[PDB]
Write a structure and sequence with these properties.
Blueprint lengths: L3 E3 L2 H7 L6 E6 L5 H13 L5 E4 L2 H7 L4 E6 L12 E3 L7 H11 L6 E2 L4 H4 L4 E6 L7 H20 L5 E6 L4 H4 L13 E5 L5 E3 L9 H12 L8
Helix pairs in contact: 2-4, 6-8
PDB class: isomerase
Keywords: thioredoxin fold, endoplasmic reticulum, oxidative protein folding, isomerase
Assembly: monomeric
Length: 233
């Protein structure tokens, strides 16, 4: 069952309550080229992502207007002012190739929480990570406080046309990665920040992370302007 059939609204609401994102197909025609292409995408990628599909009429009618849609639902605990919880597939034609691209480009949003499980999906492109005591079990309050500050700043650079991906991550979980940046792992609350480019250059924020976001802002400005020396371990 590469994609989970959702048979009621209640099963749908259950599916999307996960700590990870949901990729949900809405098809009134289970035999269409499009439905087939989604099950193909689902069979191909189900090891790293959560797929489900539905022909429940109220659901299909809600999320698409022509009985043929895909929506990504990002995790409820991560919803924020800077982006929306849902992303619709808006290409005219659904192919497995286009669908995989849409997942890769949209599933994580402005600043995912990087975990042990999703790290290989998030890493690989030019990426800023803020590391701190992220833990949505015991510390949702702290986790949101710092993530909202990273996102507020990131959103401004993104809107301005800059290309860089962002994430937050546990300074404890990723204690080993930190040594790449000459950062130590502590139980301390204040984020440390470093960028790794796709081509392997590392840039480490020097100033302390200020509550108003301006230290991050100055670091990113210098990064984009080409004013930072890279970190050599």
């Amino acid at each position: 069952p590469a994609s989970v059939p959702l048979r009621t609204e209640e099963e749908f609401k259950k599916f999307i309550s996960d700590k990870d994102a949901s990729i949900v197909g809405f098809f009134d025609d289970s035999f269409s080229e499009a439905h087939s292409e989604f099950l193909k995408a689902a069979s191909n990628l189900r090891d790293n992502y959560r797929f489900a599909h539905t022909n429940v009429e109220s659901l299909v009618n809600e999320y698409d207007d022509n009985g043929e849609g895909i929506i990504l639902f990002r995790p409820s605990h991560l919803t924020n002012k800077f982006e929306d919880k849902t992303v619709a597939y808006t290409e005219q034609k659904m192919t497995s190739g286009k669908i995989k691209k849409f997942i890769q480009e949209n599933i994580f949003g402005i600043c995912p929480h990087m975990t042990e499980d999703n790290k290989d999906l998030i890493q690989g492109k030019d990426l800023l990570i803020a590391y701190y005591d992220v833990d949505y079990e015991k510390n949702a309050k702290g986790s949101n406080y710092w993530r909202n500050r990273v996102m507020m700043v990131a959103k401004k650079f993104l809107d301005a046309g800059h290309k860089l991906n962002f994430a937050v991550a546990s300074r404890k979980t990723f204690s080993h990665e930190l040594s790449d940046f000459g950062l130590e792992s502590t139980a301390g609350e204040i984020p440390v920040v470093a960028i790794r480019t796709a081509k392997g250059e590392k840039f480490v924020m020097q100033e302390e992370f200020s509550r108003d976001g301006k230290a991050l802002e100055r670091f990113l400005q210098d990064y984009f302007d080409g004013n930072l020396k890279r970190y050599l371990k």
